[PDB]
Symmetry: D2
Subunit: 412 residues, 4 copies
């Protein structure tokens, strides 16, 4: 049974990434699929190139914000279904940022900014393309165009963290020549992570795929490939409302609490997680996304000891709880949900009674257990023969609520 | 059954207010009850007065934000349990903003800012006080101190929208001399709404509004049959705390906020959305995000949010939908809709979506969504008072959480 | 809270009773409220007296079935809303069993059968009456009629376990003259338990609570008489037999309900509706057989076990009952244990915790098979954690009970 | 594709009775007791000596099936314990001919089914704990399994079907299904072959595949150019299939009724299981369930057998569904309450609009099957919406799943 290749091991250590949707669609703020979904006249929609100034895009600020949220990589949409490229395609197309008023290779600014902050730059590429008539009219030539667009990314920006391929609504059954495309990527970017949102066709879609995406609600530890074959990692994605590109009248935002639980859940099932934000037309992080990033950032700073290196382990929680354990080489960590805030005396807020939370699968004697957020030592008992650990999971100090609270176990 | 007195009818038309928690506790950003709950030394806590600059308090910005969110009044904490007064108590106490570096009557700034935006200013007053030893040592004198503190508010700021009394953790047995306190308010501010946290029987005839739990399932209680009608109000804060709490990450979804606002109207209550200011008096960025989202919803819902009332029209089994009545229209408030894709791209909302209601007996001419004016198809059975509409899903790129259809009668 | 009077104390030890609905309505088999709810013609409906033979009523079989199910008392409907009396009213009314072909005092047969099986006989009396015009047309005279009907029951059958009064709720404003009614009962039946479906009258011993009440019930104000509590469950949606009511509860929910009643400090009545002629229906027999297996296993705790301030861990429905010698863990949501490849759900260690046990424990064992459980305690925080093993293949008790033996 | 005629007939059966009875029945601690309780094999097998079948009456079994509205019966002819309830004619000594009963139970069973116009089906466990061949010589085990089926195919005349349980034990091994099934086709061309482990069928000869009871959506009928395969779900009354005396964890009759309706909604048959006592009697508990289910299936007879799923969905937040026959549609309506009167409110008295999408034809009349009450309704033919006022139950009744028949113009 295979173990991850070094570059995949590294990918798993990244833990959290920021996904950034930004394209011509951003100017209309009605979702990234607007051209197809709203049946827009193609010519009129493509005129959006003329007002693509990128006047507020600051890759340095974006990389800084990603670092502060505790992300270790960023996936930027280099070309979405609309087919507009955020980089210099060096003559491949006129529908690129060099032909917009911006006149800046935004991908170059992005990679430079990522490097300064020690973040891996990843490139999102949509394979279903609405711009080029090649897609319907001459699919083999389309493949060449797709491949060349990828090749430019592989050869003009230095080492790349990875590629994130999106083939939602792909041509069913057509030959995508993945071995040629992935093969080319390996030749120029041997170390790049290849991610696919259609990497599972029963069975990976190509040997060169490193990561497959999964739905955020996946209950159990994800699939890592057949037992004698290359280990493939997993990734889940969450966007803040219902849309990936900015959508001004989409008010259906998830709670910050659910965001935190999703990040925790991803780690529990052995996947990375991407948190998505949609930039404004001119390239700014919207205020709403800033709020979510600030809250997530406080959680990830507290969870830093386990968020990156923590792995799933055969330790289960007791009946009726959502609690789980993550393992690093030096420690185990209890991730504890559904805690309440502690009041005092007459003021009952919910958390003040003893709160025994049990786990099954810990066989080693424990010296100390403490909450990461405030270093409070927890009392506990063990039955080593049955591998039971029971901790008194105290509630939050008044004035705080971490949503997912983490206790570090220090072994005897 | 009595109907609301005019001032209470005006209150119910306010619909939505903003609650603002700001005090010395704000500087520690660990919740408004920190002094008691964290067992602080009183002297050390009360030193916070020395750094209360209010350097970033701008009542105009706050009034403007309230206007933009669609709120029609603001409840500001004038004195919380900590017992510090945000206004000039004119010698009643040294623990007031006049004795802080800010040196500004913040209530005066607040009332002026409310008037310029046509918002009603409401004053929150805690009756359980941790600062004055009168509270435990000389309760009759405490009553006089409480009453005098309210008297200052009734006499120094012009007409006031209302008072919001918080009796949480009070002495429930004691005689609070409510007739004298409320009576005094009636004398100076005949038109003020009196709201009570702990208003069986109402706690005093002069109470106009009583508070209710956020999740109360059914239309609220308005008082006994021959008695004065009392209105209701629910409150929601964005995380678990009312004052700012920097490490409280447990924020509710904006969607739940919108559903709570709609729910309050559905059960015949006003709703307060609470924000906790920073130590220096700024609206925190997180609160701004929620206000921006809520403001888009309330602008869309303006035709019904204020004048709409509960009416004996129920929704079909398995839905959370409900109806609000104004004098000219009924409005269907429809939940659990999905976004519409196109053809092969299925987002959830594209099939016909029959939503039914029971209790509409009049022939309908037209029904349309407030957000985009799309006309809905519908059928009626007038004898059984059934209405069924095809509630189309959201246009791609939008999601209103609670979608509202206006009914136009023949 | 005062200490319960001895009769009340005895009542709480009864634990489980059988409720029996049987009247003229039983012949129709469309529910006990049929006369009112189906708007029947009163004269035509009352003709059912002419075919009330009680040909299959055997009070001995009923008492035996109650004994076998582990019930300690039986509440029999002596007169329901329909207003027909199952006993000899000695001239009070012609609408009684002595004027039916049965021509037997069924209450007499019932009390004798209860006594021989050592069960307390309780009499159910409906106070909302559809038969006598007095009810609407002359309420004060109705009160006298009601009172006399109870007086017959208090004077003609020897000592009675109790009275179960249903239906003052019909007229919540009216003066029901409870002191005279209850006082009369106290005079002739000082030890009888008075159950009523601030408390309405000082003589009331027991108050009914809904089946779903979450918390330990109310026992009256401090310095006042302690009053007990009782909950009721029927097997489908109706109390009298209802042939086309297919909406029966699971036997599992029945067992959980009985367990729940004890947890909140109440007795529980399980209701059965007899057939027209007075037989226990086959469906009710099935439920009684299943309940009887559970109550036989739970006998150590079912009668004497009382609620105690010991709570269960987050996310479990488990609870604790206290007797003078032992505590008992009542554990829900267990699965059956498979073996090796065959995973049925119960085979991993299953830590279930409780908070409020401060004393060192010597042993814990399941009542059903005597298996000893492993456990750990933290005496300072009063935490007990047991490994609640799953059921042996081939069994499933729904509510499993572990007995704690203290050092 | 169109179902083969034998498969179409199977689908019309709707409901069957599953009967578990073997040596394990004597223990009353579940049918898997020998393995799960780690019993000594020799000691367990001695149970053959007290297998009298003294209370087995195949006519009572057939009668109970008839009364519940079942159209076939699946009897366990050999379970994992490996004991055969029929004469294996020299294949094995571990059969009913070597027990005190001395009668071929299968023969009695087939005769009793034929007299009630029920199809007899034979359940056969392919995972066998008795014969050492199973672990020690799998190819020879296959021959033994096949011969045991051959006896069933050749000694009883035409049979309704075979119900194979347990190739899931060795998921990798070659079970030689073409030879086993081919043999069955040769002697019993019209028999339904059901498989417990059947997006690819395990053999072309399989007619029916089993599915989980809780499957949400209409079942899979096979790839678009290939043989149509039917589906079946199973429910037992408690947690065990064989009798289990101290298993008190019985499902509600209401859940049983909902499961039967659910099977039909998803286009499957349903088997309701009963475990006989040691000596072969139907336990009283099973009789109670049968009687309750029988009242429902008698009321649902117009649609239970011929009703099929159809692209008509119910409104948001209801569990209602529609079944189609050639002459009618039927609304199956859940979560109704009983109707009180005036001040006595039982829950069902207000107008109760229940909607469906996908009916495009004008309707003349709609009425409840249980009492013939006519329902009021409105239609929007352009959007294919039907809304009915689903009145609650008459006091004294509660059908759990209520059925309204639609009569078209």
């Amino acid at each position: 049974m295979t173990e991850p290749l070094p570059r995949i091991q590294h990918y798993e250590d990244l833990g959290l990434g920021l996904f950034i949707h930004w394209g011509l669609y951003s100017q209309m703020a009605v979702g990234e699929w607007t051209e197809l979904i709203h049946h827009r006249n193609q010519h009129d929609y493509e005129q959006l190139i003329k007002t693509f100034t990128a006047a507020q895009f600051d890759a340095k600020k974006i990389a800084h914000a990603a670092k502060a949220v505790g992300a270790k990589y960023i996936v930027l949409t280099t070309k979405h279904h609309e087919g507009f490229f955020l980089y210099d395609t060096k003559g491949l197309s006129d529908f690129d940022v060099m032909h917009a008023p911006a006149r800046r290779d935004l991908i170059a600014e992005f990679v430079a900014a990522c490097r300064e902050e020690d973040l891996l730059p990843f490139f999102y590429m949509a394979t279903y393309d609405w711009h080029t008539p090649l897609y319907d009219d001459d699919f083999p030539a389309y493949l060449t165009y797709l491949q060349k667009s990828v090749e430019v990314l592989c050869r003009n920006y230095g080492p790349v963290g990875g590629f994130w391929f999106d083939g939602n609504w792909n041509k069913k059954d057509a030959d995508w020549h993945l071995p040629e495309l992935y093969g080319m990527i390996r030749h120029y970017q041997p170390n790049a992570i290849i991610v696919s949102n259609t990497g599972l066709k029963n069975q990976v879609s190509d040997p060169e795929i490193d990561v497959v995406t999964y739905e955020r609600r996946t209950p159990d530890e994800i699939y890592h490939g057949a037992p004698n074959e290359k280990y493939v990692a997993g990734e889940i994605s969450i966007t803040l409302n219902q849309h990936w590109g900015i959508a001004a009248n989409d008010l259906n935002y998830k709670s910050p609490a659910e965001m935190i639980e999703t990040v925790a859940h991803a780690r529990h099932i052995g996947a990375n997680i991407l948190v998505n934000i949609g930039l404004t037309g001119t390239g700014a992080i919207p205020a709403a996304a800033q709020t979510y990033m600030h809250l997530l950032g406080r959680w990830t700073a507290m969870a830093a000891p386990v968020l990156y290196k923590g792995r799933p382990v055969p330790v289960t929680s007791a009946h009726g709880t959502r609690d789980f354990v993550l393992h690093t080489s030096k420690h185990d960590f209890l991730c504890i949900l559904d805690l309440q805030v502690v009041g005092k005396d007459n003021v009952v807020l919910g958390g003040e009674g003893v709160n025994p939370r049990s786990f099954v699968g810990i066989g080693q004697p424990i010296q100390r257990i403490h909450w990461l957020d405030n270093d409070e030592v927890l009392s506990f008992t063990q039955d080593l023969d049955k591998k039971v650990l029971t901790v008194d999971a105290t509630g939050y100090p008044y004035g705080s609520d971490w949503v997912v609270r983490i206790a570090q176990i220090d072994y005897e």
